[PDB]
Every structure is written in structure tokens, then in C-alpha cells.
Design an enzyme around this catalytic site. Structure first.
Site, PDB file in Angstrom:
ATOM      1  N   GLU A 137       0.785  -1.218   0.000  1.00  0.00           N
ATOM      2  CA  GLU A 137       0.000   0.000   0.000  1.00  0.00           C
ATOM      3  C   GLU A 137       0.823   1.277   0.000  1.00  0.00           C
ATOM      4  O   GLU A 137       0.652   2.134  -0.867  1.00  0.00           O
ATOM      5  CB  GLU A 137      -1.024  -0.018   1.159  1.00  0.00           C
ATOM      6  CG  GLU A 137      -2.459   0.235   0.639  1.00  0.00           C
ATOM      7  CD  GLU A 137      -3.590  -0.222   1.591  1.00  0.00           C
ATOM      8  OE1 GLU A 137      -3.470   0.070   2.816  1.00  0.00           O
ATOM      9  OE2 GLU A 137      -4.591  -0.853   1.104  1.00  0.00           O
ATOM     10  N   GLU A 162       4.763  16.575  41.533  1.00  0.00           N
ATOM     11  CA  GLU A 162       3.763  17.372  42.227  1.00  0.00           C
ATOM     12  C   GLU A 162       4.005  18.879  42.195  1.00  0.00           C
ATOM     13  O   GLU A 162       3.052  19.648  42.275  1.00  0.00           O
ATOM     14  CB  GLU A 162       3.654  16.918  43.670  1.00  0.00           C
ATOM     15  CG  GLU A 162       3.204  15.479  43.854  1.00  0.00           C
ATOM     16  CD  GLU A 162       3.229  14.983  45.318  1.00  0.00           C
ATOM     17  OE1 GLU A 162       4.172  15.275  46.087  1.00  0.00           O
ATOM     18  OE2 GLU A 162       2.294  14.256  45.712  1.00  0.00           O
TER      19      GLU A 162
HETATM   20  N1  LIG Z   1      10.395  27.823  55.916  1.00  0.00           N
HETATM   21  C1  LIG Z   1       9.640  26.963  56.526  1.00  0.00           C
HETATM   22  N2  LIG Z   1       9.582  27.161  57.904  1.00  0.00           N
HETATM   23  C2  LIG Z   1       8.785  26.376  58.698  1.00  0.00           C
HETATM   24  N3  LIG Z   1       8.026  25.359  58.126  1.00  0.00           N
HETATM   25  C3  LIG Z   1       8.086  25.153  56.747  1.00  0.00           C
HETATM   26  C4  LIG Z   1       8.887  25.923  55.906  1.00  0.00           C
HETATM   27  N4  LIG Z   1       8.685  25.425  54.642  1.00  0.00           N
HETATM   28  C5  LIG Z   1       7.833  24.425  54.656  1.00  0.00           C
HETATM   29  N5  LIG Z   1       7.448  24.241  55.972  1.00  0.00           N
HETATM   30  C6  LIG Z   1       6.467  23.225  56.496  1.00  0.00           C
HETATM   31  O1  LIG Z   1       6.682  22.031  55.760  1.00  0.00           O
HETATM   32  C7  LIG Z   1       5.536  21.639  55.055  1.00  0.00           C
HETATM   33  C8  LIG Z   1       5.847  21.291  53.577  1.00  0.00           C
HETATM   34  O2  LIG Z   1       5.849  19.840  53.331  1.00  0.00           O
HETATM   35  P1  LIG Z   1       6.908  19.232  52.313  1.00  0.00           P
HETATM   36  O3  LIG Z   1       7.247  20.268  51.247  1.00  0.00           O
HETATM   37  O4  LIG Z   1       8.032  18.794  53.093  1.00  0.00           O
HETATM   38  O5  LIG Z   1       6.325  17.968  51.532  1.00  0.00           O
HETATM   39  P2  LIG Z   1       5.267  16.865  51.832  1.00  0.00           P
HETATM   40  O6  LIG Z   1       4.600  17.044  53.156  1.00  0.00           O
HETATM   41  O7  LIG Z   1       6.052  15.690  51.766  1.00  0.00           O
HETATM   42  O8  LIG Z   1       4.291  16.784  50.634  1.00  0.00           O
HETATM   43  P3  LIG Z   1       3.098  17.798  50.222  1.00  0.00           P
HETATM   44  O9  LIG Z   1       3.605  19.237  50.397  1.00  0.00           O
HETATM   45  O10 LIG Z   1       2.663  17.518  48.759  1.00  0.00           O
HETATM   46  O11 LIG Z   1       1.972  17.583  51.136  1.00  0.00           O
HETATM   47  C9  LIG Z   1       4.503  22.733  55.263  1.00  0.00           C
HETATM   48  O12 LIG Z   1       3.232  22.121  55.488  1.00  0.00           O
HETATM   49  C10 LIG Z   1       5.011  23.535  56.445  1.00  0.00           C
HETATM   50  O13 LIG Z   1       4.427  23.338  57.687  1.00  0.00           O
HETATM   51 MG   LIG Z   2       5.630  17.568  48.350  1.00  0.00          MG
END
Ligand SMILES: Nc1ncnc2c1ncn2[C@@H]1O[C@H](COP(=O)(O)OP(=O)(O)OP(=O)(O)O)[C@@H](O)[C@H]1O
Ligand SMILES: [Mg+2]
Ligand SMILES: Nc1ncnc2c1ncn2[C@@H]1O[C@H](COP(=O)(O)OP(=O)(O)OP(=O)(O)O)[C@@H](O)[C@H]1O
Ligand SMILES: Nc1ncnc2c1ncn2[C@@H]1O[C@H](COP(=O)(O)OP(=O)(O)OP(=O)(O)O)[C@@H](O)[C@H]1O
Ligand SMILES: Nc1ncnc2c1ncn2[C@@H]1O[C@H](COP(=O)(O)OP(=O)(O)OP(=O)(O)O)[C@@H](O)[C@H]1O
Ligand SMILES: [Mg+2]
EC number: 2.7.11.1
Lengths: 485, 492, 74
Positions: free
Chosen positions: B64, B305
Site C-alpha cells: 500500500e 507534584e
Molecule cells: N520555611 C519553613 N519554615 C517552617 N516550616 C516550613 C517551611 N517550609 C515548609 N514548611 C512546612 O513544611 C511543610 C511542607 O511539606 P513538604 O514540602 O516537606 O512535603 P510533603 O509534606 O512531603 O508533601 P506535600 O507538600 O505535597 O503535602 C509545610 O506544610 C510547612 O508546615
Molecule cells: Mg511535596
């Protein structure tokens, strides 16, 4: 004759049990299946076994494959048909058509062929006849009724001649009609269906005796495997509940455990170790496999979760030198991903190797990993298979199960295998003061007494150290006890 | 020959494993599937690798497509057939009909065509033959029986010629008959089925070797992908459980963790971090990836994510400069929505990038996300694949999992992967006095001792600080504890 | 057009003739076809699928009394 229909053995492993003795003598059995189910292999093995076990000559009529090919293919199974043809024990009747071409030589069709098969039968004093793909013959331009008549004619002449025949058909639907024209089903005395069922990207070959006019047989589908030795069927429902049972004991490799089990595991027994991930099932296995070498006995560790190298790293870090066990030819490690096979296949590999090594102990690390994907019913069938085999063979078996939930697990097994088992060792995490401690418990032991305590235990380089029970605590089974003061 | 049939390697990635060595020499293999499944490509790659890797000439018969189009489309994979034609290594024999017109072209057809083929085979000293869509030839006005015979004729003649052949056919149902006439399946010695199965609204391509008369082969479907390098098959069931295992340690990027793990993670090991949303999985990842740069090793962070920007904002706020890791060429970020592909695709993208960058560490932020939609078994298969690749490649892998329920989670993983993993790091919320604090635990570690404490921990700009356990609590795990101790200190 | 009184093979030839001439002329063409089943054969005669260079399927799926249109490049 005046008696119970006589059967010719096929010697095809497992088939004679299913068929309660073999193919009915002097009648023909239809064997149909879709492409690649093993119709051709069945029919060759029936003839080949005839010749090699009973010195019954055979005639193999081929309508499509070439005799050179049939011969070439059998080499897959280490079978020299060319030798048998030469010794006059086998005769391959070539009824295939001319690659070249003509269209007026077979106007004497069925009639003529029937004469050459009768000539061959008489000539070689044949007892067994295999006609390969009769279907392909009328696949010239026919309708259901025309096929019914031709088939009948043939079956009948062969019946007169006195030959036991295997006729092969093709199907297009795994569970649809029995053969192409929905007519062969009813014209044969016996019907055998070979299926290659798909289901989840995996294939599972099952054989079924749908009917044997005049005798009985096992009903339904039985799994089978095509191997270097050809067709191999496991009639898992044909295994009897007649395993030998002793009172002799054997060590677990862990003295304290032996104590708790009232002096050790029973030689004739199936021991189950269940626990959340990381509780230490694999450490027990290691230890149980090691105890058989220190007593100069052979043990096989079928591993489905860890590499042969990792198994060695972790084992060596717990004392025990798996390296030596290997050399000493006392210990054999296997290792394979559950995904690298069907349960049927796995089962056989296991049997197989047990046969080549004749172990005294056997450990399957994580039945729970073999249950991945598969159906519960397919899986239970597998367990009964490996279990039952070890039980009737006097082999002591230690099987492992990881429970889907750590702490709070409400059943011993999620697949409900407890009950097919004699001894159940149970490992669990217990939250004690912001820490994760372990506990071991001999949950049940069939012919002995065993300790009822849920003893806490530690893991070090030396191995498992079983300590004392959490006497001063409530709800230890929850995983989150409540120290009462 | 007194030997069992020998195979010819296709060199098509993954195929020779599934077929235990290749296609049976001198026989023909029927390859059929629906529209766009990759039939034509398989056949071209079979000839192409034949020529480029063994210097075996090939004849490609087309009913073809036009030879110009066959050459033109192959450029999609970086293949110059026009060149090979030229050097007499490949010969496309045009069997297509002319856009003008003639009747009764069924008879001479086969026969003429057959010597045309024989002629070409003999002429170029061909070892390989591909006949593209024999189907379309009797799609002139025929019935099953006429098809069966013609096929038989053709296969037969080719067998006589001694050619190893690939024949192509079309299907109209993904799980319906093997090939259009419901007859080709039986006439061929070997049958291969290419599927392009729908489902969701995603399509998954699979290859199945249904039967090979004479030899063994893997059974079932195997997922494959068409890429710029053609057909690529992953025999996930052919991967062996023989991965190397060392006692070498490496850092998690968090000292305190390292202690808890009895001196850091194993180099050879799959790590899983789990816990409810917001726990601190991504923080652990970031830290684990950074640790490989500070040690001048390469690491890839496959994120499903967060955006590449967001990852950078959040990282910088935890100290660690992802910017530098990038420049310095030690750290490579990926990023893609789980939905922008099928698991098969993802798995390959991962493998591909591991080959171009040769990482020492790898982190996939959220397996849990890749599980979105896909079936559990399709998923588990995916994990074993990435997991096992990592493992046989001596790459330390940290995978993340968000549990569907915060507090009260009764199983490590909802998809039950815990068993497919060496070390497990668990993060959980603990309600302490109307406040949501965190806890971190080394749930398990295959070759070491690790700490059994459920240590509380905080997150600041410095990163993760692991404090002490909740000794005076019962039901820590439940997420909602209870304090104990009913005797402070009094008299004698 | 062949919905005048034709069978699969006649359709495959005619289509092929047309597509072919069009390619010669150098034209970029869009040819439309009907299907009766949302997930069955690609087009009526189960022959157009393989005769074209590219295939696009427009679907209008039912499912729960709502209708969802999808486009697929097959
Ligand atoms: N500068 C910061 N100071 C204090 N706490 C922080 C700071 N940055 C992030 N956090 C805390 O860490 C968390 C972020 O979670 P992380 O990014 O570790 O990933 P995860 O819990 O594994 O996944 P997901 O965010 O998708 O739920 C926030 O909910 C917050 O309470
Ligand atoms: Mg995360
Ligand atoms: N040594 C071997 N080890 C494992 N499998 C084998 C081996 N040899 C052949 N096979 C398998 O057995 C099959 C052979 O089937 P067989 O030739 O018996 O006939 P069939 O499927 O019944 O009919 P048909 O003539 O339509 O192909 C192959 O498809 C292949 O899967
Ligand atoms: N050298 C060691 N010293 C102290 N503890 C160790 C040592 N090696 C392993 N462990 C402990 O033993 C556990 C290992 O469990 P094991 O390998 O016995 O299998 P498992 O719990 O049965 O199954 P799985 O690992 O698949 O979950 C770890 O969680 C860890 O706490
Ligand atoms: N470079 C490439 N990258 C990824 N996908 C490719 C690329 N080139 C082509 N494709 C995909 O491969 C397909 C080509 O299929 P192919 O031409 O192999 O034959 P077919 O589907 O088997 O048969 P036919 O189209 O002749 O009916 C395209 O539909 C497309 O999806
Ligand atoms: Mg283990």
C-alpha cells in the site's frame, strides 16, 4: 464387549488422572483450541508416548504442517521422530496441499484419504492415530451440515478400523463455541478443550475434558504448562488428603522459639511466619534455613522479595554465612520476581527444583509477594499445591506472609491461608514509650503445646533475641498498648 | 537439521528477550494489530537492524505505502533507507496498485509476486524479508478459505526460498480475532500481536508473542513505546533478581537521620518516605539530593507534584540552593504531570535520563502521584521497574509516598509497595495539646540497626531538626495521644 | 458515496485510488467518515483506517446521560 470402557494411557503427565485412566480405546477424542494452545503437541505426545512406552505404533496425519516441520518442531522436546519413522514405529501421513498448485486431484477427497490412513494403519500395525487440524480440510468452502457429515464419516471408519484417535480442531473464542463449525462437539465421543486464557496481560493454559462418552473423568479446567518435556498438567483437585504425619521435631534455628513451640517444629509441618513489613520474617527464614545445614541437610530458600546478593549481605550481618552453605552444597537459593511467571509455572519450578535437590527444609520467603496480582482463588490453589506437595514429601516448610497493615491487623492472613497451615508464628510491632518494639508469638501449633505469651524480642548482629512478655500491659494486640500501673 | 529451530536476532530492544533469541530462521512471523499499532515500524526495524548489524540484506515488499513514503517515514527514526537502497543492502519492491486501473489481478498476482520476490531475494542475497500488509492483497473480494490457501501458498514458497520473513496484518478489534480472516493465525508458524489498548482515555501499546512453533518464548503482553529510536519493549517480567549489594553507607542529608539509620542509608538500597500531606517528604528529598552535590556526585530529582520554580522557592527557604546544584552540573530536576503520559512512557523517560546523566542518587517525589488513575497492578509493575533498574544500577533511590489519610493511617502504603523496599522512613502528625506536631521514625532498614524511636521534629529555614521521642505518651501512632505519669515527688 | 451498494474490498480500492491521486496533486486533505459504534471499528467498512496516512477519531460518548466529546489522533 460386555464391560467398563477401556482406556489407553497417554502418559502425558497429569492427563491420565484427569481422564481416569486415559483415552477411551477405539474411539476418537476431539481436542480443540485457539492458536498456540498445544493441540499439535498433545497429539504428537500421544503418539510418541505410545511408541516409547508400549511399543504401540502410530500414524500421524498432517493437513497443514509439513512432515519435515513436524519433525523439526519435536526437537524442541528432545524427540527424534525421524528415527521413529525410520524404525517403522511412526508414520507421518502427509495430506497437506501442493505449494505449487492444481485443483482437481481431491475430487475423491474423504474417501481416498480414508483409504490411505487405513492402508497406513494396517501397514505399521498402528494402534494410535492423530489427525492434525481436520478443520483446515473443509476450510475449502463448506457449511456446518457438510462438515457434520464428513467428520462423522471419518470418525466412524476409524472406529471400524479399531483405532484410538486424537482429532485436532481450531477455535477463535477462548470461551465461545467448542470448535469452528459448532458441529464437531457432538460428533466426537470425547471432547477435550485446550484454553490459553488471557486475563491481565498474563496467559494461563488450561486443559478440560468436556465429555467422555461412557466413562467418568474429572470435570472443569486444569492448569498446565508446555515445557521442554512437553505438556505437564497439575490436577490440584486430584491431590488426596493422605499425607504422612510424624511426631518428630526439628529446630527453628532459634532455640528460644523451639522452646516456645514445645520443643521445636514438627518435621511433618507447614509453618507460617506473618507480620507487618520489617518485623523479621526474613530473619527467621534465614535462621531456619541455616539450621538445616548445621545438621547437614539440604534446604532451599525460594526468595521472591530480595536479590541473591542482598539476601547474603543481610544474612551475613546477622551472623550466618550463606556463602558456605552454598559451597557445602547444603543450601540452594532461588530468587525470582513473582511477575516473571504464572502461578502454575512458579509452582512447577518449585516442584522441579525440589526434585533435583531433594531438600529436607524449604522456605518460601513471602507467599504474600506471590499473591501480587493474581486472584485469591488462583492463589489459594497455589498454596494448597506447594503446601500439599511438601506435606506428602515429608519436607518441612517455612512460608512467609507480610500483612498489609502494620499494627492493628485484624486477621492472620489477608488471603486467609491460616487453616491450610499447621504452625503459625506471629510477629508484631508494639508501641512502647515512643518506640517501636517487636513481639513474637507462637499463635497456634497443631500437635504440640506451645507457649501463649506475646514475648518482646530484639534483633542484633547475633540474631533474634526473645525476651519476656508485656505482662503489665493491655491491648498489646492493638499495637498501641496501655501500660496499666 | 537434528537441532531445534534457531533464531535470528531482531536487535529490536526487548524483543529478543521476549522471543528467547529472535525470530525463527527460515520461517515467517505474522505480526498483526490494529491501525497505528506499529506493524510497519516493526518490519522496517527488523530489516534495518538486519543490515546495520549483521550486514544481512533485506527485501521489503510493500502493498500500500509508496517506496518514497516508506523511505520518508523512516527518517522519523534517523534511518536512511534511501542510502541502503543505494548500496544494494535494501530493496523495496513496490507491489502497490497504480492510482490508474486494471481488473482481474488476483491470479498471476501471488505467483508473479513470488518470483518477483524470489528474484529480488536471489538478486540482493537477502536474508530478511518483510511483507507489509498481505491483508490488503485479498482485500480485493475474498472469503476465509481462499485466504487460508493463498497465505499457505505464500508462506510455503518463502520457506522453500529459505527466507526469514515478517508478515504484517491488520485487525479491527483490540481483543477480537487475531487477524482479519480468522485464518491467518493458524497458517503462520509464528504469531505476534501488537495491541494499542485504550482504557481511561489513555492508550497503552503492548506486544505479545502468541506462539512460536518449535521453541519457547515469554508469554503474555509486554508494554512497549515507539520512540525516535523505534520500538522499545520492557520485559518487566524478564528482569532478574540478581542485583549487587554493598555495605557502603551514604548520607540522607540529615545527620540525625543518619544516626537513626545506624550510620546513613545503604548505597545499594531503595528508600521510601511516607506520611500524610505536609509532613515533610519533599523536605527530606531536597536534603537527600543536595547531599549528593555537596559530595560532588550527580543526582536526578523527578518531581510529579511541584513546578521547577516552586521546588526552587521552597528549597531556598529551607537553606539549600538548588540554583547552584544546577549550574555546577551535579543536580538535574525533571518535572511532569502524571497525566502527561502512561506509566510505560514515564518509566522510559526515567531510564533515559538516568542514562544521559548517570546519577549516583535519584528521587521521585511522589510515587503516590504516579498512582493517580492507573490500576494497582499496572502501578506495582511500574515500581518494580524503576525500583529494580535503580537497584541493578547501584543508584541510591529515595521514593516518596503521600498517604490518603493524615493520622490514623493503618498501612504504610495504600498501594502495598512496602515489601518492594529496603528502608522505610515514616512521617506522621501527632496532635499534642491542640497543636499539630510532626514525628519521624525509621520504620525499617534491611541491613542495619536503626533507631526504634518515634522522634518529634520541627521544620525551620535551617531545615529538619529531629528532637526526642514522646516517651510519656500512649497511642502516638494513632496521631492523637495521651500523656501518662501520676506521681511527681512527695516526702519519704 | 459507496453507500450506493458496495462491499469492503471495493471501498478499499476506490479510497486508495482517491487518496493517491490527491497526494500526486500535492494537496493536504481532510476526509471525513462515519462510524456507528463509539468504540467499535474506526469507520464503516473497517477499511478506511489503513488506507489513510493519518487517522483522527471524533467521539461523542454517552456515559450517564451526559455527553462528552473527545478527539483522538490514532
Ligand atoms: N520555611 C519553613 N519554615 C517552617 N516550616 C516550613 C517551611 N517550609 C515548609 N514548611 C512546612 O513544611 C511543610 C511542607 O511539606 P513538604 O514540602 O516537606 O512535603 P510533603 O509534606 O512531603 O508533601 P506535600 O507538600 O505535597 O503535602 C509545610 O506544610 C510547612 O508546615
Ligand atoms: Mg511535596
Ligand atoms: N520447548 C518448548 N518450551 C516451552 N514452550 C514450547 C516449546 N516448544 C514449543 N513451545 C510452545 O508450544 C506451542 C506449540 O503449540 P503447538 O505447535 O503444539 O500447536 P497448536 O498451538 O495447538 O496449534 P497450531 O498448529 O495452530 O499452532 C508454542 O506456541 C510455544 O508456546
Ligand atoms: N544487623 C542488624 N542489627 C539490628 N537490626 C537489624 C539488623 N538487620 C536487620 N535488622 C532489623 O530487622 C529488620 C529486617 O526484617 P527482615 O529482613 O527480617 O524481614 P521482614 O521484616 O520479614 O520482611 P520485609 O523486610 O520484606 O519487610 C529491620 O527492620 C531492622 O530493624
Ligand atoms: N518518531 C516517532 N516518535 C514516536 N512515535 C512515532 C514516531 N514516528 C511514528 N510514530 C508513531 O508510530 C506510528 C506508526 O505506525 P506504523 O507506521 O508503524 O504502522 P501501523 O500502525 O502498524 O500500520 P498502518 O499505519 O500502515 O495501518 C504512528 O501512528 C505514530 O503514533
Ligand atoms: Mg524480608
Amino acid at each position: 464387549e460386555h464391560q467398563a470402557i477401556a482406556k489407553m494411557r497417554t502418559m502425558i503427565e497429569g492427563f491420565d488422572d484427569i481422564s481416569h485412566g486415559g483415552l477411551p480405546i477405539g474411539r476418537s477424542t476431539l481436542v480443540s483450541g485457539t492458536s498456540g494452545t498445544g493441540k499439535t503437541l498433545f497429539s504428537i505426545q500421544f503418539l510418541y508416548n505410545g511408541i516409547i512406552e508400549f511399543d504401540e505404533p502410530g500414524v500421524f496425519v498432517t493437513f497443514e504442517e509439513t512432515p519435515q516441520d513436524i519433525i523439526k518442531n519435536a526437537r524442541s522436546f528432545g524427540w527424534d521422530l525421524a528415527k521413529l519413522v525410520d524404525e517403522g514405529k511412526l508414520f507421518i501421513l502427509d495430506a497437506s496441499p501442493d505449494p505449487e498448485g492444481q485443483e482437481v486431484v481431491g475430487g475423491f477427497d474423504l474417501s481416498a484419504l480414508i483409504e490411505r490412513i487405513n492402508y497406513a494403519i494396517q501397514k505399521y500395525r498402528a494402534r494410535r492415530v492423530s489427525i492434525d487440524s481436520v478443520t483446515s480440510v473443509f476450510q475449502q468452502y463448506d457449511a456446518s451440515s457438510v462438515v457434520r457429515r464428513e467428520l462423522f464419516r471419518l470418525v466412524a471408519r476409524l472406529k471400524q478400523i479399531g483405532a484410538t484417535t486424537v482429532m485436532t480442531t481450531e477455535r477463535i473464542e477462548e470461551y465461545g463455541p467448542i470448535a469452528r463449525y459448532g458441529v464437531e462437539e457432538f460428533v466426537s465421543d470425547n471432547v477435550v478443550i485446550l484454553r490459553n486464557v488471557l486475563e491481565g496481560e498474563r496467559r494461563r493454559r488450561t486443559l478440560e475434558i468436556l465429555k467422555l462418552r461412557g466413562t467418568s473423568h474429572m470435570k472443569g479446567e486444569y492448569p498446565f504448562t508446555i515445557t521442554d518435556h512437553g505438556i505437564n498438567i497439575f490436577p490440584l483437585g486430584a491431590m488426596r488428603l493422605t499425607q504422612r504425619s510424624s511426631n518428630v521435631r526439628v529446630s527453628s534455628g532459634v532455640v528460644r522459639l523451639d522452646e516456645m513451640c514445645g520443643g521445636g517444629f514438627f518435621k511433618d509441618s507447614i509453618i507460617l511466619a506473618t507480620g507487618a513489613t520489617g518485623t523479621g520474617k526474613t530473619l527467621l527464614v534465614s535462621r531456619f534455613v541455616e539450621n538445616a545445614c548445621a545438621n547437614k541437610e539440604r534446604a532451599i530458600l525460594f526468595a521472591y522479595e530480595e536479590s541473591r546478593a542482598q539476601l547474603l549481605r543481610n544474612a551475613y550481618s546477622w551472623g550466618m554465612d550463606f556463602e558456605e552453605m552454598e559451597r557445602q552444597n547444603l543450601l540452594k537459593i532461588v530468587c525470582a520476581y513473582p511477575e516473571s511467571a504464572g502461578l502454575e509455572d512458579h509452582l512447577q519450578i518449585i516442584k522441579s527444583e525440589i526434585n533435583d535437590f531433594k531438600p529436607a527444609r524449604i522456605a518460601i520467603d513471602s507467599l504474600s509477594a506471590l499473591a501480587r496480582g493474581v486472584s485469591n482463588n488462583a492463589f489459594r490453589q497455589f498454596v494448597i499445591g506447594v503446601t500439599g506437595y511438601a506435606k506428602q514429601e515429608e519436607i518441612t516448610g517455612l512460608f512467609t506472609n507480610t500483612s498489609d497493615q502494620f499494627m492493628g491487623a485484624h486477621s492472620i492472613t489477608d488471603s486467609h491461608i491460616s487453616t491450610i497451615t499447621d504452625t503459625i508464628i506471629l510477629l508484631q510491632y508494639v508501641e512502647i514509650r515512643g518506640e517501636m518494639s517487636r513481639a513474637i508469638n507462637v499463635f497456634k501449633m497443631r500437635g504440640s503445646w506451645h507457649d501463649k505469651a506475646i514475648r518482646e524480642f530484639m534483633i542484633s548482629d547475633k540474631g533474634p533475641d526473645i525476651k519476656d512478655s508485656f505482662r503489665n500491659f493491655e491491648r498489646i494486640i492493638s499495637g498501641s498498648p496501655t501500660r496499666i500501673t
